[PDB]
């Protein structure tokens, strides 16, 4: 589901934005994803981030008709230097 | 480029200018059944003619 992934990216960005304005800043350089993702122990918030991903973007026009299949990705959230981050969906076995 | 909300590959991007494109009837005219996909129609065409 496209729009849900869309909402994930938004929502999570919005929360991090909360902690950010909690000080005063949206500046990205101040908050490298360490800050938000290190487990509580190491002194991070430990928030479990499945925003990141890359989000299948293919050519809406026809995707109102055919189901054209993924041709492209749109960067969900970002970094500055990247690394990556593991996302929940990958640690949960699917129902089937 | 702006007014159509397109982007020349090396180009400046802007805002929609006619934002609501999303309204559409489900209507047979330009449908797929009845069209031939032979050459894709890149943007630069749409900015060129």
């Amino acid at each position: 589901t496209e729009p849900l992934l869309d909402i994930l990216v938004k929502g999570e960005t919005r929360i991090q934005n909360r902690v950010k304005l909690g000080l005063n800043s949206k500046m990205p350089t101040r908050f490298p994803p360490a800050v938000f993702y290190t487990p509580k122990e190491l002194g991070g918030l430990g928030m479990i981030s499945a925003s990141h991903i890359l989000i299948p973007a293919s050519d809406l026009s026809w995707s109102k008709q055919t189901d054209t299949g993924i041709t492209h990705f749109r960067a969900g959230m970002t970094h500055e230097d990247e690394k990556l981050i593991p996302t929940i969906f990958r640690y949960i076995t699917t129902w089937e | 480029g702006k007014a159509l909300n397109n982007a020349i590959p090396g180009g400046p991007k802007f805002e929609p200018l006619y934002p609501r494109e999303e309204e559409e009837d489900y209507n047979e005219f330009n449908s797929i059944d009845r069209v031939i996909f032979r050459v894709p129609i890149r943007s630069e065409y749409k900015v060129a003619f």
Binding site: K10, S61, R74, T78 | -
Partner: peptide
Amino acid sequence: SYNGIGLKSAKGSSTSGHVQRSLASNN
């Protein structure tokens, strides 16, 4: 060549708007 893939704009959408070809699916 923005071909219809991508966004109206990343102003509200929280992403960077970056779009890249998908290596996987071609045939």
